[PDB]
């Protein structure tokens, strides 16, 4: 029979039945499953340091962002984008292709076709659950202990005065695997006193670090997460072949394959220079990158006044509403550029979510 996996070390965010205010630090903020009081109650240590108990039965206060740190894996599968084998964590199987699967990083990282609907297969014992397409689904940003985050020692700290003392601060340089069997479970920290080391952030449900300034850890399809209880659209090898004589490839760049960077610079080398929310800047062959977005916060844009097309564009991205009719042809301001490249636009006093093709720069 199917049974619940008490996956200590799971990286989680707030769930559908959440009613505990700002304990997590806000929606999308990440925490670590420390332990299970019972099959109905779980203890989470949020990246902001707040530790608390939550419901995981009947009511569900938590969603699983990443179970990979628990070491749970689907032997006999491979992610067809990054070639992780076995898939560790949640398994995502394309329902619309023959024998195609993604890992969590690649799935939330918009690999494969966004219009292809996937099965979620949370555990080896799980029955597969057909999802809506990513292209029509809401995407929010994860926040907490990620690259660029400002941290102090956490509750499970057992590493002497490597940080220079309790309360002394450092910067998360990179999220790493504490072990091969537990990916995405550690954070490498460069302390303000020049000391540096690797610390547990999820491994065996441990929390060695605590945010004083959380950082963005990429975006995810919230409603596709199971309850507890410029871009690069080319394969790595193609990128590698293209990067020869345009900056080359190193292993510090793996962020770029699933992370949206911003074109901060061009250069005389016929090449491009891109920064990422980690703080790193990287150089590329032009053919490696694809643009979107073409907009910036503050851009004035006119809403498309072809109703057929805006209906198509909005429905295609799961954002059509008849109440949008009076916005056609109106000029508005780009308030925010979402992670799925849709635009928060302020028009008619109100704000709406637009397919970027449904507006034109003034």
């Amino acid at each position: 029979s199917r049974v619940m996996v008490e996956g200590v070390g799971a990286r989680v965010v707030r769930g559908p039945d959440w009613k505990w205010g700002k304990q997590d630090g806000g929606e999308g903020h990440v925490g670590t499953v420390r332990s299970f009081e019972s099959p109905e109650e779980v203890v989470v240590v949020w990246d902001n340091g707040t530790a608390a108990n939550y419901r995981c039965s009947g009511a569900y206060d938590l969603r699983i962002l990443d179970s990979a740190p628990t070491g749970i894996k689907h032997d006999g599968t491979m992610c067809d984008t990054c070639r992780q084998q076995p898939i560790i964590g949640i398994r995502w199987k394309c329902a619309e292709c023959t024998n195609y699967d993604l890992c969590t990083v690649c799935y939330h990282g918009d690999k494969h076709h966004l219009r292809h609907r996937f099965y979620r297969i949370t555990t080896p014992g799980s029955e597969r659950v057909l999802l809506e397409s990513r292209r029509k689904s809401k995407k929010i940003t994860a926040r907490g202990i990620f690259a660029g985050a400002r941290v102090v020692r956490g509750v499970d700290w057992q590493w002497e005065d490597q940080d220079g003392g309790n309360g002394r601060r450092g910067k998360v340089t990179e999220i790493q695997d504490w072990s091969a069997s537990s990916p995405h479970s550690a954070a490498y920290v460069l302390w303000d006193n020049g000391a540096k080391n690797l610390y547990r952030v999820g491994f065996e449900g441990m929390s060695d670090l605590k945010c004083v300034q959380d950082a963005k850890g990429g975006s995810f399809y919230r409603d596709h997460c199971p309850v507890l209880g410029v871009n690069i659209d080319l394969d790595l090898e193609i990128v590698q072949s293209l990067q020869h004589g345009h900056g080359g490839w190193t292993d510090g760049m793996f962020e770029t394959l699933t992370t949206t960077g911003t074109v901060c610079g061009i250069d005389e080398d016929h090449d491009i220079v891109v920064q990422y929310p980690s703080g790193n800047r990287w150089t590329f062959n032009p053919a490696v990158l694809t643009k979107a977005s073409q907009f910036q916060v503050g851009d004035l844009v006119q809403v498309c006044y072809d109703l057929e097309r805006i209906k198509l564009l909005q429905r295609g991205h799961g954002e059509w509403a008849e109440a949008m009719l009076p916005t056609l042809g109106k000029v508005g301001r780009v308030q925010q550029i979402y992670s799925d490249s849709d635009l928060k636009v302020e028009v008619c006093g109100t704000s709406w979510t637009y397919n970027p093709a449904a507006v034109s720069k003034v």
Binding site: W20, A52, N53
Partner: peptide
């Protein structure tokens, strides 16, 4: 550690 009613 916060203790929720639950």
């Amino acid at each position: 550690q916060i203790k929720n009613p639950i």
